[PDB]
Design an enzyme around this catalytic site. Sequence first.
Site, PDB file in Angstrom:
ATOM      1  N   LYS B 155       5.844  13.797  20.898  1.00 13.64           N
ATOM      2  CA  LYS B 155       5.667  13.876  19.453  1.00 13.64           C
ATOM      3  C   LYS B 155       6.329  15.206  19.138  1.00 13.64           C
ATOM      4  O   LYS B 155       5.769  16.267  19.418  1.00 13.64           O
ATOM      5  CB  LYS B 155       4.194  13.950  19.038  1.00 13.64           C
ATOM      6  CG  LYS B 155       4.001  14.110  17.513  1.00 13.64           C
ATOM      7  CD  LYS B 155       3.224  15.376  17.167  1.00 13.64           C
ATOM      8  CE  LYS B 155       3.149  15.628  15.647  1.00 13.64           C
ATOM      9  NZ  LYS B 155       4.496  15.899  15.031  1.00 13.64           N
ATOM     10  N   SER B 208       2.127  26.013  16.538  1.00 11.15           N
ATOM     11  CA  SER B 208       1.281  26.915  15.762  1.00 11.15           C
ATOM     12  C   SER B 208      -0.190  26.873  16.144  1.00 11.15           C
ATOM     13  O   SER B 208      -0.648  25.953  16.824  1.00 11.15           O
ATOM     14  CB  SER B 208       1.403  26.592  14.272  1.00 11.15           C
ATOM     15  OG  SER B 208       0.854  25.311  13.989  1.00 11.15           O
ATOM     16  N   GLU B 229       0.776  26.450  24.360  1.00  7.46           N
ATOM     17  CA  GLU B 229       1.805  27.485  24.282  1.00  7.46           C
ATOM     18  C   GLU B 229       1.944  27.771  22.792  1.00  7.46           C
ATOM     19  O   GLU B 229       2.699  27.102  22.091  1.00  7.46           O
ATOM     20  CB  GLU B 229       3.129  26.957  24.843  1.00  7.46           C
ATOM     21  CG  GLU B 229       3.139  26.717  26.351  1.00  7.46           C
ATOM     22  CD  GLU B 229       3.264  28.002  27.150  1.00  7.46           C
ATOM     23  OE1 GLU B 229       3.516  29.062  26.538  1.00  7.46           O
ATOM     24  OE2 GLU B 229       3.121  27.954  28.395  1.00  7.46           O
ATOM     25  N   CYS B 263       8.510  32.703  19.428  1.00  5.40           N
ATOM     26  CA  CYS B 263       7.144  33.096  19.734  1.00  5.40           C
ATOM     27  C   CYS B 263       7.112  34.418  20.489  1.00  5.40           C
ATOM     28  O   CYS B 263       6.156  35.191  20.368  1.00  5.40           O
ATOM     29  CB  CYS B 263       6.457  31.991  20.532  1.00  5.40           C
ATOM     30  SG  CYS B 263       6.260  30.477  19.553  1.00  5.40           S
TER      31      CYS B 263
END
Lengths: 459, 459
Positions: B155, B208, B229, B263
């Site tokens: 996804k 997120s 993560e 990130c």
Amino acid sequence: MSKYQSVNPYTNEAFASYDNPTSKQIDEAINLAHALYKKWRHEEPASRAEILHDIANALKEHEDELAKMMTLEMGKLLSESKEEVELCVSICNYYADHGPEMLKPTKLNSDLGNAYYLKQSTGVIMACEPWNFPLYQVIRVFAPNFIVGNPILLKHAHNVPGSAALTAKIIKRAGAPEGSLINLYPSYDQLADIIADPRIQGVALTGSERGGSAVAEAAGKNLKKSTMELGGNDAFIVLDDADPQVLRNVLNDARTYNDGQVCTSSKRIIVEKSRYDEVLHELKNVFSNLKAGDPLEADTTLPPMNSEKAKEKLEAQVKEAIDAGAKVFYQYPEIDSKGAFFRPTILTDIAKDNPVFDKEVFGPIAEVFVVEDDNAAIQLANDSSYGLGSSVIGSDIDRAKKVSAQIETGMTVINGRWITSGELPFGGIKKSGYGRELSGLGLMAFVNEHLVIDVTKNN
Amino acid sequence: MSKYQSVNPYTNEAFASYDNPTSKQIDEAINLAHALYKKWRHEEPASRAEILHDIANALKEHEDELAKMMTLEMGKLLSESKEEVELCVSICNYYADHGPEMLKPTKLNSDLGNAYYLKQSTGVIMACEPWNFPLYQVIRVFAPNFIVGNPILLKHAHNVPGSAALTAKIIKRAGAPEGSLINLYPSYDQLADIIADPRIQGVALTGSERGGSAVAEAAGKNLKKSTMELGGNDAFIVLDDADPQVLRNVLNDARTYNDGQVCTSSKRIIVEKSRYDEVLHELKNVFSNLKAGDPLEADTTLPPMNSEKAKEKLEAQVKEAIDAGAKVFYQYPEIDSKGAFFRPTILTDIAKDNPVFDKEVFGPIAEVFVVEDDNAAIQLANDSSYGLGSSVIGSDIDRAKKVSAQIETGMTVINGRWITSGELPFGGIKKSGYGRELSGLGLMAFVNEHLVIDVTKNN
């Protein structure tokens, strides 16, 4: 209000009740533990090894007191309670002797620079444990994390509050700084709030699917790493070449240890046809020779279940199983006692559509299945929502190893029933949970593998 | 209805929309993947290594097509998109060359019997990935799990459906059996239902905090192992002895790589006082020399943000930061374009009580802090709810290593900005998540360490 209470299953009488803590007491505990976590960051794991060895000695020193408290709260045979203490002394000594060594930095091979990763602590761990192995469940998580430097907040089962408090006290007095292991009696809501506190960085649980789901859901919502050690419905596979003597020795307690209240109890005994009648006969021999009585007495070999409620739930499961088609090959005689005694029973002909087929049955209930060959044994073994442990009994070791590999489960014992030790990983798959406790794997459960790479050369 | 759509951030024009699948299509996908999982159980990891190498070659072969699709969907500079493909080719080759070897059974030292554990597959993994590194995020999870034998249902982010579909197609045609990697466009509710299916045994997510929480909560409720993560707010520590040249080279893209949408971007630049003015000047030099334009064009060095919505959210964060006390040391000139361009900005004087102090800011926004000494640098670095990556710039390596060790984070690069490779573990702590991807750690994320112990001797 509080569900924390000590009730003797042998006399079915309560002897102590404990309240949930206040918000203030909880905050003070988290504060103490977090402060300890920070202090430990500057103290090598070896510095805690000595203390862990002293804890091991203290457990041995208080063996009879600890064993008695366990037996009084959840009915385990005193002999088994003492064996549990011995196991815990061993686990503590194991991590005291091998933990620091396994926490040395690991060099990484990379042409990108001089790399390596440190194995650091992460923070306070919220440990939720069950009543079946009150000391071992706690020590399994405490020992390795104490060495790593992760303080532990403990929420033990509502029915072993006395054993929980005693364990925490012995450990503190042995030398573990305040905050190393703090026992608390939180309500489910308080537990959820603790998991949501940023000072809590790990959640470890051993117990039921029901409790696991709720706690794991909370850990997830709060993005906290977790390990789940849940129930099992282990396949005990008896091959046509099983040695008669090995088989006999193992069946002595493969299903009746701790009254069958073991996640790795041999719940689904899968026997190849030529040995079906043999296994049934042996189980009947074992079960029929058990002796009910005070679990504190040496001659007692059949203890009561941990609680009257547990006994009633089991009666309901068995009845549902029988009403759906399970047959009673044998049932222990009636037991005249106000205690929570359940009669050892041997069930057969449990079909795939039986409600109990894929349901963990905690209690002295042998479930025997008959299969045609190795493939059928494996197929039935894997026709499960669980996957914790397993056993394969057969004289041909190569054959046994091949069958073992095909079982979808976390562990398999060849020619023996469930086993556990500090050097062996314990954990499962599917509904039995995830993550591993004990061995080097459990040691790393809540460790921060901190990668450090010097790339000066390329910049 | 479906939020899956391809919208070019440079022209702010949509060019493709995708529907959520039907319940039937989802079931068919899970069925195919589960069937593949069963088949793979009987096929060695080495048997998939060749195919993974072929996949690596196919990615290289389609590099320009893949890079263009990425740039068209989320605005990344084409040069960076190509670098991402190269990184992925490398990761695939890494696991093709080292994966099977790392899956050999491990012998355990125990006097309890002949013990060892097998590293087996667990089942279908539900992978949820973000738009910032559309190919790398997928390959990071696919490569190791393909070798292990865990099929993947993907996804991907709602804004990279074209890149997701293309990636899955290339991998299938390269040789990966149908079911190895199936791309799906599920709604959040469908995703939750998939996670609840017993055939799904792992959940891997990169993205997120918001998305992570929801997905991790579902995984927990369903007792499925997961890896998270998430974002970071990495401390880029500049010591007083940082080499001027190293520092300059690193600051070239420490905060502006992928427009700061990383990130592990160096979001909190913590500088010891004697080098504060120097760092500010260099950042201004780097930022002022960027050139906005079509990310497909070679001369463009400042791409637009991934979406107009992302640009607007960033404008809101910066405004809130400034209204709370953050000062604008520098701001790139106005950019005349209908594209989602955000002007590189350098902020200073961000106090502990500023709303942005402990908030991840995805975008070209340098946040510079000044500190007195090493202890203050570490203290500020750890005054964070995050802990993904970090950097320490200093000529004295011993000093740098000592400081690095004290940072509460998952990785630290000495004299360089964020880095990633097949042999290096990637992951964080706290709000940045848990679990590790890549290296041997990521390979074991969804592996069943199946203990097998022969105890015939004692029974």
